[PDB]
Amino acid sequence: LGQQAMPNRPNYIGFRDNFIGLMYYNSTGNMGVLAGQASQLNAVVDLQDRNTELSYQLLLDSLGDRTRYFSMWNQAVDSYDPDVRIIENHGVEDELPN
Amino acid sequence: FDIRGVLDRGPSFKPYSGTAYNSLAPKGAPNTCQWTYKATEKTY
Amino acid sequence: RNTELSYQLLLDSLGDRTRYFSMWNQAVDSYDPDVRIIENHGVEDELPNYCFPLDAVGRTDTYQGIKANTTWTKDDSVNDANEIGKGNPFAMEI
Amino acid sequence: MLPQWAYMHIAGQDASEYLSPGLVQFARATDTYFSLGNKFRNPTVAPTHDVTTDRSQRLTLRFVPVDREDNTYSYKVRYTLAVGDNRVLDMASTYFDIRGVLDRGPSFKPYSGTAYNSLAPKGAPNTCQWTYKAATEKTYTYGNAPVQGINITKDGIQLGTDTDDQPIYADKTYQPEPQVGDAEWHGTDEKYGGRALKPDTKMKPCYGSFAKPTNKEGGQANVKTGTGTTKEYDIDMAFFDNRSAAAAGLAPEIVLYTENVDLETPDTHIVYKAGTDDSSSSINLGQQAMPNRPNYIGFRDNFIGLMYYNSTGNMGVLAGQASQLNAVVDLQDRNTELSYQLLLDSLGDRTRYFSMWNQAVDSYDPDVRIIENHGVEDELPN
Amino acid sequence: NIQANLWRNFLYANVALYLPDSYKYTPANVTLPTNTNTYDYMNGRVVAPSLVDSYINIGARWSLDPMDNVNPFNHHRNAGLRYRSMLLGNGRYVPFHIQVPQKFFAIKSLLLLPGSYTYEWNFRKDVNMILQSSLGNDLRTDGASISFTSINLYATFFPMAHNTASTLEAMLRNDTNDQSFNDYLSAANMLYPIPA
Amino acid sequence: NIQANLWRNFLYANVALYLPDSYKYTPANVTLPTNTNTYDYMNGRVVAPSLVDSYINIGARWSLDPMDNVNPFNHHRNAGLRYRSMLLGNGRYVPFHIQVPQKFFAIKSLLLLPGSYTYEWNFRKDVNMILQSSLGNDLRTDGASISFTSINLYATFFPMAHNTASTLEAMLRNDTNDQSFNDYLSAANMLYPIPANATNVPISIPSRNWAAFRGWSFTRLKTKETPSLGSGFDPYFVYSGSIPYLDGTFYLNHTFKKVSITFDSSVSWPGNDRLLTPNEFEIKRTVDGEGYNVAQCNMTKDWFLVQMLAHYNIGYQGFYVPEGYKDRMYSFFRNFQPMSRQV
Amino acid sequence: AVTSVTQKKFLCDRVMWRIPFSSNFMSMGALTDLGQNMLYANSAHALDMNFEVDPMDESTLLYVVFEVFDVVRVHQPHRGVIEAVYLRTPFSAGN
Amino acid sequence: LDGTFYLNHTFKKVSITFDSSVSWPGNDRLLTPNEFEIKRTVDGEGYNVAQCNMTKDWFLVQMLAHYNIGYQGFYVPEGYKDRMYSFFRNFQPMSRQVVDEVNYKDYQAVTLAYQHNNSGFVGYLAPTMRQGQPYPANYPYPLIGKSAVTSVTQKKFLCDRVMWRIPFSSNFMSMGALTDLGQNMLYANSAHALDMNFEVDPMDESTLLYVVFEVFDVVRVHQPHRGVIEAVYLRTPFSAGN
Amino acid sequence: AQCNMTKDWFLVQMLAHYNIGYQGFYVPEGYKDRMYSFFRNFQPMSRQV
Ligand SMILES: O=P([O-])(O)O
Ligand SMILES: O=P([O-])(O)O
Ligand SMILES: O=P([O-])(O)O
Ligand SMILES: O=P([O-])(O)O
Ligand SMILES: O=P([O-])(O)O
Ligand SMILES: O=P([O-])(O)O
Ligand SMILES: O=P([O-])(O)O
Ligand SMILES: O=P([O-])(O)O
Ligand SMILES: O=P([O-])(O)O
Ligand SMILES: O=P([O-])(O)O
Ligand SMILES: O=P([O-])(O)O
Ligand SMILES: O=P([O-])(O)O
Ligand SMILES: O=P([O-])(O)O
Ligand SMILES: O=P([O-])(O)O
Ligand SMILES: O=P([O-])(O)O
Ligand SMILES: O=P([O-])(O)O
């Protein structure tokens, strides 16, 4: 009768910022192709020590305001609550009994 | 690339803190309920 | 013609409508975005929260002091009616 | 590599120069409705001559004082600030780097509320005792005993059992522990133990109460002096049976492990007690505690006040080592600290903080300065 | 003490529960998976609230030493991830429809001239790569999956006057007018192991 | 009632506890220090919570009359001061290491040329001057103290090419290339006593030249919050809160009714019939029968005009909100707060 | 609702009140039109000001900033030589 | 992939040495001229800065590298130049005091299981039902008041989101994407090798050092006729292999 | 954009307010996206039931 329950931990699940991970980049056996239809030389030449996903993160930040969200590209930057990362413990205003 | 598909986020997906069910109940309180016990078998 | 609307749109093009200016009652109608679109992320209620009696015990029984002679006898250096609770403090939960 | 760098627009012309003139005119005429700018690299190329020395040379110098005066009210340092041959120094890059020892003192309290038993009702006592003589002097007790025992005998509360099947009694120096209790809200009569404060430890509300531990198992009993190699504590068991129990059948229902401890209230004060009396007593069981007012203490915004300015007998000096004519001429009439506050505001955003100069402007909560009372959304009972 | 309770619930939900697993325990009478990357493991391990209590470094602004090295973006208060979760909905079963941009530097901003081009791309199905969770559990083991029903390419064209468009194309086919692009990060990227 | 309790606690902690001492009492059975500048006095005086209860001017936006004249920066929700306290740590004992800038206008931006220079400065040990508390208590009496272990000077040098530096040095030694600096505030600063309950503050400036005079700025300070810099140490400074004179935390501007200005005790400035009440600058009116108050408060239309012109050049061609980057932290519009209540 | 009266007021923290010695109060140059004319009404003048304030039951201070030009010119003619010339005008410098 | 960096505070120093002989930047440039000291725990000279354990040298390097600020004083960069992944925006210095376990004479090393604070009102070692009795707390030691314990000070910083930056520029400043020293290396009569050594705080799991060697990673695209697209890639230096 | 708005309409509205649409969709500069502008107010939303 005295068993106690606690809520399960929250776990949000979505696609990543800017849909990172969905398209293969910088991954040798899965290179994208953009070629002239006849003479199909691939104009895309990618390398494993290039980092296209991070390059795009940084480009977006240089071009505009990353605190703004744009649903079309899942453009919604990963963030954290600053008052969770660094605890500022100024106590509580509990002077009055309740 | 315009992508459509079916996603299952699976049984670990929980987009909220707390419960949807009897959230105001003290956390060790039972439902109104019964049990049997034998030290003849009886219902309590 | 619509002069009142024209001025609203004009004001927004010239400056920052989130600022207030009492002289012209310039304080734009708005709403709480969290009221218009409910974001229900639940509540952080993992820890139970308790109400306690003012004295932090609640119901007590009355006890006398006793000392071992094992036989036990009344200890006359001790009050014979001390209020002590057994177990945890009475509590309610919210 | 240079023909390559030109070809890849790593160096060489910008696009308005290397693109065909017809294309540049075309782009310029159409840019506001179809933009071509981002499709053509425009290299930027650092200069390689006459900017930076190739010689061995320090970026940052540290000067230690060549003389100093440590007085009652002030501290004076003298440096030989050296600008070497073929260098210039912007004084904006200079500063005084100060190390020392600060005591903010006993009125510093960088928080609201208490660190100690903050959830305790503010007039609730600790489990404790007092004496009273109406006359023979008796010991009285109030509180609760939360640790359930297998039994209680003259050796105290039995907390467990051996592999030899013999009782294990509480070790009085730390058991029973006040933080332990029945684990659920939910047939016979049960025996219990707990700690209690002795009469000589003057009552304080539970809320705010701290006593340092005197052993690594968290017990707080005062350690007895002149004991030699044996550590002894001020702890005595007190046994109790129901006031209504038959005299011929007395046996302990409750045992309290009573102790004196170094009880303090580092961050709360008494906001109600019935009289001037301080002692443990029946009436003092209901004293009420309130947390001390917060009082942040730091150096000032932009370290105002640390350096003397506009202050006749403590004027700063910058003088050529040839002359001695001081280039600093200051006036009691001038306001250097405020001038600097206003200058900072005109240069940048004073809501941003910069630790290096303690640049963190004084502000207040606008909802405290000007009370906006829209009441409360208390429509649902709770 | 209402204020003290709000503070303690906050610290517990947002900090104590995200402490490294070495700060936690399994009650006897509790059986958890041996797979430590699993939600039931991360949900079942118990954290003593007094590890981050309302008196934690009281009066300080201070991140906890063990938390400095805990990924702070794996958290239910990551507002970007929370928004991305909620864009899809609140249930585990989601028919989705999304638009995914081209990020490869060489073609992402290219002005492409008249002609027919083969354009092919590959898309991942691995839920640990394409999905993100706030706890960071192994979504393969924890039963998430995805199916692609269709992927179409959309392309938008400025309705350019045909003569003006002929002029533009003519200019852009001259090698003098070759387009060029630098990867923004513009780096050779290297990873080196650091043993525990 | 959870919501009512949240609000009542907030009001008590943030407003009622900061009411002037005249609203407080000392219970019989409590002995407080006789020194009223001490923490134990400020912490021990009792405030009735119903002085600022959850029904305080209910439905209004209104600062409390007694609070208008209390320094609102001496407060535990002063976020700058709270951050500066926490930069040091959460304990009373702090070995510290800080960098202190040079602020004197004549040297703080000077480009110094090769040579050896004597550079000397004096630092304060007075805790009420160099430290700040949110309560404002006398830190000397309440046991704060500092010692300096070492002060070193740091300087950074652009690693300039030596031919370039040498050419630069030679040019800067020419008198036609002397450097020059104005103090930003650029004022002669003057303080005049206002005895308790005085309402008129006349001042004379004995006859002088006014060529290049730029104008006047002014405000009101508490004597207890204004230290003397008239010597090495001020024994009468028994306060450690914000010091508006030095830091710009002004908060008594609403207490000015009016200023009038008269050259050569016979020529009123601006006179010229320029102002609605042309013989003075009226800041605010209580009796306002022509209707000269403006902007839903008691500030006059003249004064609003003068301040908007003085800060923004706004006024001759309609009043409007100034561009945010022109309306900075110590600017008029940003800080202007008209208020009303009924009773 | 009870019979009532209304009260109006304002706060304005953080500022100093400003009265520019400019003919239309506007900023048209650091050296103002009227500051320049004072070189032509080229006599000395006395100034009297009378401030009226709300009573406060503690001593206070009127703080007046007289806005002038407060300037230094710095001359460094030879290695290790520095010479500074200070001029505050009007309100030229004291001790 | 995503830029959510959070372990930058764990770097202590890096040395950079060409051909095993030539320390870079060398030339007596930094206060500690043979390496980049990022942070110091022992700091007898007082080279640390901004109220944390970061060094004056490193703070100069990162402010020049991001904003060209350092030679003419330190100050807050303009907000629009100090963006989401920039140094200043993310720099978080912090301090605290704790009991001095060596010199506080009454110190007792009480482990979690034997502490009590809110005995009677909270669950024991679990987020479960309250247990116990009202009793004076034995923990934490007060750092304040008339009986404040003997203490010590700890300081550190976080700097999430950034990558640490060392520009190959003679004065560390951004004067051109093609740096002055990049141009000089063209007149290198020979090829050079590079050693680097990073010193980091130990972490009880496998981690990775991620180095970005900043170069020019370029493509030029030629479309001579309808349906024809030709591309020339050059990454230089560190020219490609895939 | 993860709602029931069409690509056509999103193009017209982005062009109409910002001239954005023939060269990629992206967030307009804040000062061109004012209180009554399209992007500032656009709120796509989903749920399951
Ligand atoms: O409503 P929250 O952000 O305090 O959970
Ligand atoms: O390169 P230099 O002119 O500083 O010797
Ligand atoms: O200043 P305290 O030690 O009486 O609180
Ligand atoms: O702009 P603030 O300093 O009042 O928050
Ligand atoms: O409170 P800690 O986890 O930084 O010691
Ligand atoms: O597209 P047109 O206007 O050149 O026919
Ligand atoms: O067909 P064009 O490329 O010569 O216009
Ligand atoms: O006439 P006022 O002062 O009530 O506006
Ligand atoms: O949009 P602003 O005018 O508040 O900067
Ligand atoms: O004239 P100087 O440069 O030899 O001092
Ligand atoms: O030398 P410090 O600033 O790290 O104590
Ligand atoms: O420095 P060198 O050996 O490449 O000329
Ligand atoms: O015109 P070509 O040289 O690309 O065949
Ligand atoms: O060479 P093209 O323009 O006719 O393909
Ligand atoms: O020799 P590399 O560094 O130009 O590839
Ligand atoms: O474009 P933003 O920086 O004003 O949001």
Domain housing F196: 186-336
Strand ranges for chain E from DSSP E: 61-62, 93-99, 117-120, 131-133, 145-152, 179-182, 187-194
Contacts of D295 (CB under 8 A, 6+ apart): D107, D108, D109, D110, F39, F76, F133, F134, F135, F137
* DSSP reduced 3-state for F93: strand
Buried b (16+ CB within 10 A) or exposed e, F171-188: ebbeeeebbebbbbbbbb
Chains in contact with I via at least 3 Cβ–Cβ pairs below 8 Å = A, C, D, E
Task: Tell me the C-alpha to C-alpha distance, in Å, between residue E131 and each of B17, D140, E34, F175.
Answer: 20, 65, 24, 69
Q: How far apart are the first and last CA of chain G?
A: 65
Ligand 10 atom 1 nearest Cα: G78
Q: How far apart are the first and last CA of chain B?
A: 63
> Residue G71: which of F181, F134, D121 has the closest Cα?
F181
Buried b (16+ CB within 10 A) or exposed e, A66-92: beebbbbbbbbbbbbeeebbbbbbbbb
Report the Cα C1 to chain-centroid distance in Å.
53
Which residues in I lie closer than 8 A to residue D34 (C-beta atoms)? 22-23
Separation of alpha carbons C51 and E2, rounded Å: 9
Separation of alpha carbons A40 and D18, rounded Å: 30
Amino acid at D372: E
* DSSP reduced 3-state for H212: strand
Q: Are strands G17-20 and D297-299 parallel, antiparallel or unpaired?
A: unpaired
Contacts of D48 (CB under 8 A, 6+ apart): H180, H183, H184
Task: Tell me the C-alpha to C-alpha distance, in Å, between residue B43 and each of B28, B37, D357.
Answer: 22, 7, 75
Alpha-helix runs per DSSP H in chain F: 2-14, 39-44, 65-68, 79-88, 127-130, 162-172, 244-247, 301-312, 332-335
The H-or-E segment that residue D320 falls in is: strand D317-320
Separation of alpha carbons F292 and F270, rounded Å: 19
| Residue for token pair 């060029």 | E180
Task: Tell me the C-alpha to C-alpha distance, in Å, between residue G35 and each of G28, G90, I16.
Answer: 12, 9, 52
Q: Cα(E135) to centroid of ligand 1, in Å?
A: 18
Ligand nearest to the CA of residue D350, numbered in listed order:
4
Query: In this complex, do D247 and C74 lie within 8 Å of one another by their Cβ atoms?
Result: yes
Contacts of E184 (CB under 8 A, 6+ apart): A55, A56, A58, A59, A62, E105
Q: How far apart are the first and last CA of chain A?
A: 30
DSSP state of B22: S
Report the Cα F262 to chain-centroid distance in Å.
28
A50, HSE (Cβ side, Cα atoms, 13 Å):
32
Buried b (16+ CB within 10 A) or exposed e, E146-175: beeeeeeeeeeeeebeeeeeeebbebbbee
| Residue for token pair 């005895």 | F195
Cα angle: E14, vertex E20, E24; to 5 degrees: 90
Strand ranges for chain H from DSSP E: 11-18, 22-23, 36-37, 91-99, 151-159, 194-200, 207-214, 216-222, 230-236
H134, D120 contact by CB (below 8 A): yes
Separation of alpha carbons A91 and A89, rounded Å: 5
Which residues in D lie closer than 8 A to residue E167 (C-beta atoms)? 26
Q: At what angle do helices E2-14 and F2-14 cross, to 10 degrees?
A: 100
Task: Tell me the C-alpha to C-alpha distance, in Å, between residue F175 and each of E19, F170, F178, G80, G83.
Answer: 66, 11, 5, 16, 11
Q: How far apart are the first and last CA of chain I?
A: 21
Supply φ then ψ for residue H59, to 5 degrees: -60, -40
Q: Cα(F321) to centroid of ligand 16, in Å?
A: 20
Separation of alpha carbons H74 and H47, rounded Å: 16
Q: Which two tokens stand for residue B32?
A: 């109104």
CA gyration radius, chain I:
12
DSSP state of E46: B
Ligand 4 atom 4 nearest Cα: D363
| Residue for token pair 């707060």 | F337
Separation of alpha carbons D235 and D170, rounded Å: 13
Buried b (16+ CB within 10 A) or exposed e, E36-57: ebbbbbbbbbebbbbbbbbbbb
H204, HSE (Cβ side, Cα atoms, 13 Å):
5
Ligand nearest to the CA of residue E167, numbered in listed order:
7
Buried b (16+ CB within 10 A) or exposed e, D167-191: bebbebbbbbbbbbbbbebeeeeeb
The string of DSSP letters for I13-31 reads HHHHHHS-SBTB--PPPGG
CB atoms within 10 A of CB H93: 20
* DSSP reduced 3-state for D94: coil
Kindly tell me whether chain C and chain B come into contact, counting contact as 3+ Cβ pairs under 8 Å: yes
CB atoms within 10 A of CB H209: 14
> Residue E72: which of E143, E24, E15, E29 has the closest Cα?
E15
Cross-strand partners of E95:
B6
Burial of H193 (0-12, 13-18, 19+ CB in 10 A): exposed
H92, HSE (Cβ side, Cα atoms, 13 Å):
20
Task: Tell me the C-alpha to C-alpha distance, in Å, between residue D287 and each of D142, D178, D276, F60.
Answer: 14, 21, 12, 37
> Residue H39: which of H52, H60, H54, H61 has the closest Cα?
H54
Q: Cβ < 6 Å from ligand 14: which residues?
A: E 173; H 225-226
DSSP state of H182: H
> Residue G7: which of F331, F60, H189, I1 has the closest Cα?
F60
CATH value at residue F243: 2.70.9.10
Separation of alpha carbons A5 and B21, rounded Å: 12
DSSP state of D283: G
Separation of alpha carbons H6 and E21, rounded Å: 19
E37, HSE (Cβ side, Cα atoms, 13 Å):
10
> Residue D8: which of F280, F256, H177 has the closest Cα?
H177
B28–A contact, CB cutoff 8 A: yes
| Polymer length of chain D | 382
DSSP state of D228: T
DSSP state of A79: -
Q: Cα(E172) to centroid of ligand 7, in Å?
A: 9
Q: Cα(E80) to centroid of ligand 1, in Å?
A: 14
CB atoms within 10 A of CB H143: 26
Separation of alpha carbons F192 and F220, rounded Å: 10
CB atoms within 10 A of CB H147: 14
The H-or-E segment that residue C3 falls in is: helix C3-14
Amino acid at F95: P
Separation of alpha carbons D306 and D65, rounded Å: 18
CB pairs under 8 A between B and E: 97
Cross-strand partners of D205:
D125
H202, HSE (Cβ side, Cα atoms, 13 Å):
2
D377, F5 contact by CB (below 8 A): no
* DSSP reduced 3-state for B5: strand
Amino acid at A36: G
Q: Are strands H22-23 and D210-211 parallel, antiparallel or unpaired?
A: unpaired
H33, H26 contact by CB (below 8 A): yes
Task: Tell me the C-alpha to C-alpha distance, in Å, between residue D187 and each of D148, D190, D240, D330.
Answer: 13, 9, 21, 87
Buried b (16+ CB within 10 A) or exposed e, G31-64: ebebbeebeeeeeebebebebbbeebeebbbbbb
* DSSP reduced 3-state for H194: strand
> Residue I24: which of I16, I14, I34, I32 has the closest Cα?
I14
Task: Tell me the C-alpha to C-alpha distance, in Å, between residue F184 and each of D348, F106, G88.
Answer: 14, 11, 13
Check whether the bond before A7 is cis (ω within 30° of 0): no
Query: In this complex, do E130 and A22 lie within 8 Å of one another by their Cβ atoms?
Result: yes
Separation of alpha carbons D49 and D244, rounded Å: 103
Alpha-helix runs per DSSP H in F65-108: 65-68, 79-88
H242, A28 contact by CB (below 8 A): yes
The string of DSSP letters for D117-164 reads STTS-TTPBPSEEEEEE---EEEEEEEEE-EEESEEETTEEEEEE-SS
Separation of alpha carbons A84 and C43, rounded Å: 16
Q: Please report the sign of the dihedral spanned by the C-alpha atoms of residue A14, residue A15, residue A17, residue A21.
A: positive
Separation of alpha carbons D320 and I6, rounded Å: 75
Separation of alpha carbons F137 and F238, rounded Å: 7
Separation of alpha carbons A34 and A40, rounded Å: 9
Report the Cα F270 to chain-centroid distance in Å.
28
Q: Which two tokens stand for residue H39?
A: 């942070």
Buried b (16+ CB within 10 A) or exposed e, D125-157: bbbbbbbeeeeeebbbbbbbbbbbbeebbebbb
Question: To the nearest whole angstrom, how far is the Cα of A5 from the nearest Cα of chain F?
Answer: 24
Q: Which of D341, D349, D351 to mutate to test the pocket of ligand 4 (most atoms within 8 A of CB)?
A: D351
Alpha-helix runs per DSSP H in chain H: 56-67, 87-90, 180-184
Out of A2, A12, A23, name the one closest to residue B28 (CB). A2
Separation of alpha carbons D362 and F73, rounded Å: 6
Experimentally, how was this structure solved? X-ray
DSSP state of H131: B
Q: Are strands D254-259 and D191-197 parallel, antiparallel or unpaired?
A: parallel
CA gyration radius, chain D:
38
Question: To the nearest whole angstrom, how far is the Cα of A66 from the nearest Cα of chain E?
Answer: 10
The H-or-E segment that residue C6 falls in is: helix C3-14
Separation of alpha carbons F54 and F6, rounded Å: 10
Separation of alpha carbons B14 and C41, rounded Å: 10
D178, D141 contact by CB (below 8 A): no
Separation of alpha carbons D62 and D45, rounded Å: 34
Alpha-helix runs per DSSP H in chain D: 2-7, 15-18, 21-30, 336-347, 366-369
Separation of alpha carbons F287 and D197, rounded Å: 67
* DSSP reduced 3-state for H79: helix
Separation of alpha carbons G37 and G22, rounded Å: 10
Separation of alpha carbons F13 and F55, rounded Å: 16
Q: Cα(I21) to centroid of ligand 14, in Å?
A: 28
Supply φ then ψ for residue F216, to 5 degrees: -130, 145
Residues 332-361 of D with CB under 8 A from G: 332-335
Separation of alpha carbons A9 and E7, rounded Å: 18
DSSP state of E176: G
* DSSP reduced 3-state for F81: helix
Supply φ then ψ for residue F158, to 5 degrees: -50, 130
Residues 192-251 of D with CB under 8 A from H: 194-195, 197, 204, 206, 209-220
DSSP state of I46: -
Separation of alpha carbons E94 and B15, rounded Å: 13
Amino acid at D42: N
H51, D355 contact by CB (below 8 A): yes
H115, H138 contact by CB (below 8 A): yes
> Residue D97: which of F156, F138, B9 has the closest Cα?
F156
* DSSP reduced 3-state for F307: helix
Q: At what angle do helices D21-30 and E162-172 cross, to 10 degrees?
A: 140
Separation of alpha carbons G90 and G21, rounded Å: 13
Check whether the bond before H25 is cis (ω within 30° of 0): yes
Burial of E86 (0-12, 13-18, 19+ CB in 10 A): buried
